Amino acid sequence: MVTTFVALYDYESRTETDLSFKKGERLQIVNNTEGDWWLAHSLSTGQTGYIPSNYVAPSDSIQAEEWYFGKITRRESERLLLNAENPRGTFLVRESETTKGAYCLSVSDFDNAKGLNVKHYKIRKLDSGGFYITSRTQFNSLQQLVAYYSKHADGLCHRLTTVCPTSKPQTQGLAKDAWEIPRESLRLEVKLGQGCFGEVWMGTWNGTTRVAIKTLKPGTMSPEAFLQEAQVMKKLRHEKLVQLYAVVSEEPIYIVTEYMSKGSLLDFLKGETGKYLRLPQLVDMAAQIASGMAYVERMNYVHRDLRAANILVGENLVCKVADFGLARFPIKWTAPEAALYGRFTIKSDVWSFGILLTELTTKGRVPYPGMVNREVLDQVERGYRMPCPPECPESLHDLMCQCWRKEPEERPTFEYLQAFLEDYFTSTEPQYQPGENL
Fold first, then answer.
1. Is 177 known to be catalytic?
2. Where is the Protein kinase domain?
3. With 0-12 CB in 10 A as exposed, 13-18 as middle and 19+ as buried, what is 35?
């Protein structure tokens, strides 16, 4: 039939042909084919229009439930669950990444020895159609398991109390078929930064939506070579990359992306924000950046300008790779063969990541302290490399030295760097609570 969907978040209208809704509103949708915007009809308000498809789930599905987070990893479930204000027994249900087919109940806990921690309980999918954590207490569905452990601890660490708070996500695109937008639809209001290609502003699209807008001085790039680059970038879709929403293509080129108010990593390492970062948090930020770049690597594309100034920070120490060097002077981050011969590859990005690692372990200090752009290039071509920073572990510097091999083909992959940094204090995230309480 017409499928009835339930809204998972509020959504405010942006254009003349999309549809406002509130969390829990049921919407009829006839063609729910894979896509980013669907045509909906509300049976509450009678109103019609396009809605972002990641804001709804089929009524009566496990995806319609507030506590089902789906394809989130153990890392990222712990990022949300370890938010220090939410009480003992805050929880979510997700898929297991250790064992295919199986689910996982992740619950915040607290102990006098270990403090605030997260416990993970394997939810067995009985091959005949049931669910359990222990085989003495079985359930027909995940929602009966959760209804149950909300009243009874019964071998869990805590009774399930509060549904894990998440933030309402981005839509994919600003609107159904919005890409090349008119300059009039953008209001540049607040200055975020200035660069060697353009300015970065905070503004609004259509009066309604917060966006970030990056401008590029005319002459940087012919709009055609730019537009070809921007649609490659538009195809990229990852939790650890900033989304490119829209573009003003004529000259002066605008690039419209997701605004992130906490700002750059570079500014975040410094001062009041960066005085609460310890090694564990800095290694966590590096691992997220490596995740984003591992996707870029998988997608056979290139950043060309990776550094802490081009990483943006979100809630719970989220880091996203931003400002792709689509128009490619940060010579201190540029691989020798990239600066000398114009050879920008995923391998020159690996070099830049090594330089970004010294920024993360030095509270944001500038690379090659006391060298100028010309000095660095000639010193680096001689084989010079920054020494291990004070307060940086020798094994993180060993990682930097692998990133800084002279030959691009001896530099490791972003898959390797992600694995290394996710495993650093030992982890692909393997620890489940056994079945042996009351």
1. no
2. 186-425
3. exposed
